[PDB]
Symmetry: C3
Subunit: 348 residues, 3 copies
């Protein structure tokens, strides 16, 4: 009485084929989660959602095989909008998600716990749908994120973390709009203080051998995003453009002083199950101290998903990695090899 | 047919505000668990319960984010009582729980895996309700706990653990009684052997710099508890008094040779959702070698919970920490700062 | 509509009694899992299964307390057979499982992540039931396993692991057949390349103090298995014989150049719940370099299970360990002490 509660998840039998040893092999994993709603009164509704990743590709004595992707509780007051708090998606992703639809790859001009660009600890999000019911299809969002800092130091918080996934106080906003038939447009902005260890950490160069500062200096990390989306007539066309400031990771050795990020995807849905997909993603870093302008990410993606029904599917995906081995990709530990994925997935 | 089985849990979007860096920030977490019953025959019933904590306030590459709070299987033979085994609550908590009702704080003159004072590995518990159906409201309990020891040494067990959470063989008993209207009284006693590493470990002083024995010497660890509870007329009044012997932790540097523990709470339930709450907790350690008598814990707590319904609530809680920085709180790593909590929680 | 989905698991309140400190004490744990089916069309069916182990015998600050036992997605095309991929049982276990029916012990002439002998990462399995519906009771299986390698080195994969649980490319096949009344016969074969760290790792001798190669040299690891099973008239008789080549572990210091493995079990099911059980298991290693022929495993097992119903049971099991302390069992860290188990288990 009153409460709805759904168990959901999937089991993904997955194998990667690649020349990069740290990528190649068995990638089997599963997801399980919970979605809940309670109607409090005719205007007010409470909700909660949890989503868990459980790796299955290592042993029963291996370590760190599970993690939480989402955990948030929330309130939705009809026409006034909604508010939720917890681990949830940064609002930049309200736009960039429109290109995150590849069978297995994609969605990686950005990472998780990467300021407000994806999933994020301690994020307070306000959302409004049809501009208070006055403008159908015109959604916007306002978000706040507290500092998630180091385990020690001046910038310690209880939930410490290495410098690549720390953040200071920040906010972000997003707007999406539906234009006539299926065509949607979106903008998103975010801004965060950085942390001492982000500005004061060093790293040791796989090429020279010497020690240097972690790429990126700055008091602030920033993203600007614009996106377009065609969805109708069994066509899916989408693109997104994002420009960032000390916000985009350069492998594991820091951030890019400036980076320009671009993703474009085209897909077609046959009504006998098959869903082919073509995509291009790049990330171009600027003024990265001793590395100057370099590609951070650059590939073409080709793949397809076969849907047996809403509970079962198979997919192949082929990442054609147009990066070259150099001192930047080596010193930053960015993979320059191709990958093939092959998946058979049960959903529930 | 025959079996009942309930999924239960909650998602708790929670943030702490504090000057103590190791406490402050995002504290989002979730609980999920299972409660089960099977009727074997008209007298005999089997049951099982599991309860899991999943942290959500750190990253997807962080470690140790989940843990089990309860896991026990059991048998209940009508009027003869019940028996269960596994990870479950030490019976001291049958009384001290009556003060563990604060919105977020409280319940911490004692810890988990802290002999029979709270949740505990390998605990065999016998419970009897209305004294075999002869005295309505008069419950008692008998409990046994095997040694949970070190990872190495003379006192090794399979499930080793640091000295602050080891225990030797022990037992405990508890009695509660309902007096007329809502007024309940309770007593509880426990006794355990200690372990070699508890008596033979050293620690390094954050103030002097030198090495010393871990506070507390003794073959035995002991607790005596008395408690009172008023529940009726939308009032909740409760208090509990506990005296311990090498059983109460002194931060992370050992145990208190003697400690006197006191908790008192008053709450009021308005029938429009709001539930204000006032509380006082102290822990006073005695004869702690080079530290003598010191406060181990001392605060006032002020907070409130708003229940939208049985599935949704919001709460604020304010811990006013009356401890002062000194060599004891510093050398033992006890927090002396205030904390505010702010939570929005979905239950299912 | 279309999808079946079952939550399943058990809570096992369990205690071990033993002179081996690393074995003795509380062993409480739980299992939880998911089994799913979707009918795609009248011939074709998709399925998925996940099964999770959650330890409960250590603290809430302990590490590595959970792990995945099974995670696989699959397809079943009526008379043509089935195919599944993920973490699943190596097909050798299609036969050796017939002796894995002891109340608590047994099933340990082999381990998990032990080539195709038990549960295994990245295993692709084809199964066929009544030989395409032509021969009732005659099942066979074909299986493939990709390399699961080191975290570094020439044999790195993404899901690295210590040498005792690495494997190279391998395959395995199995056949079972039902003979008239309850009597079944089975054969199974497997073959895998080994890995550099399996052939190139050293270890330090608990008896001498000096360094030596990890037992077992060889390009290939191999198993041959035959098994018999009587099931009917409330009798359970089963035996299995397996001969292995650099495939059977010698504690933690390597593999046995050759090992001959034997298990035999007899049980009786009274229809008032009780199920007594008697068993013998040995593992005899050959030509193990400086250790020559030694017993790797040798015990008698005596125990019983009481079933209150399909959801509740109690069991005792007594492992009489006929191994002697020597340089082999010490240098390999194999336990030579007896064990008693005592369990009360709730299933759902």
């Amino acid at each position: 009485d009153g409460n709805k509660l759904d168990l959901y998840g999937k089991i993904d039998g997955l194998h990667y084929f690649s020349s990069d040893d740290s990528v190649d092999g068995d990638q089997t994993y599963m997801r399980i989660g919970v979605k809940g709603e309670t109607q409090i009164n005719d205007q007010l509704t409470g909700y909660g959602q949890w989503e868990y990743n459980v790796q299955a590709n290592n042993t029963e004595s291996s370590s760190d095989q599970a993690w939480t992707r989402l955990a948030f509780a929330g309130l939705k007051f009809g026409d006034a909008g909604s508010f939720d708090y917890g681990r949830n998606y940064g609002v930049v992703y309200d736009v960039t998600s429109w290109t995150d639809v590849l069978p297995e790859f994609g969605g990686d001009t950005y990472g998780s716990d990467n300021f407000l660009q994806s999933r994020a600890n301690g994020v307070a999000t306000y959302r409004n749908s049809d501009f208070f019911g006055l403008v159908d299809g015109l959604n916007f969002a306002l978000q706040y994120q507290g500092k998630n800092g180091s385990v020690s130091g001046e910038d310690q918080t209880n939930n410490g973390r290495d410098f690549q996934k720390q953040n200071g106080e920040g906010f972000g906003t997003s707007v999406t709009y539906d234009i006539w038939d299926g065509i949607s447009a979106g903008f998103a902005y975010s801004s965060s203080k950085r942390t001492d260890e982000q500005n004061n950490s060093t790293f040791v160069s796989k090429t020279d051998g010497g020690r240097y500062g972690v790429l990126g200096e700055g008091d602030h990390a920033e993203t600007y995003t614009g996106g377009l989306k065609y969805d109708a007539n069994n066509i899916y066309l989408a693109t997104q453009y994002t420009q960032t400031y000390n916000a985009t990771r350069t492998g594991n050795i820091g951030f890019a002083n400036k980076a320009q990020n671009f993703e474009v995807v085209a897909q077609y849905q046959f009504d006998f199950g098959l869903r082919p997909s073509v995509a291009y993603l790049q990330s171009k870093g600027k003024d990265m101290g001793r590395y100057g302008d370099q590609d951070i990410l650059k590939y073409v993606d080709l793949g397809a998903t076969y849907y047996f029904n809403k509970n079962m599917s198979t997919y192949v995906d082929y990442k054609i990695n147009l990066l070259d081995d150099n001192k930047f990709t080596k010193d930053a530990s960015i993979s320059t090899d191709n990958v093939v994925a092959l998946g058979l997935v049960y959903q529930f």
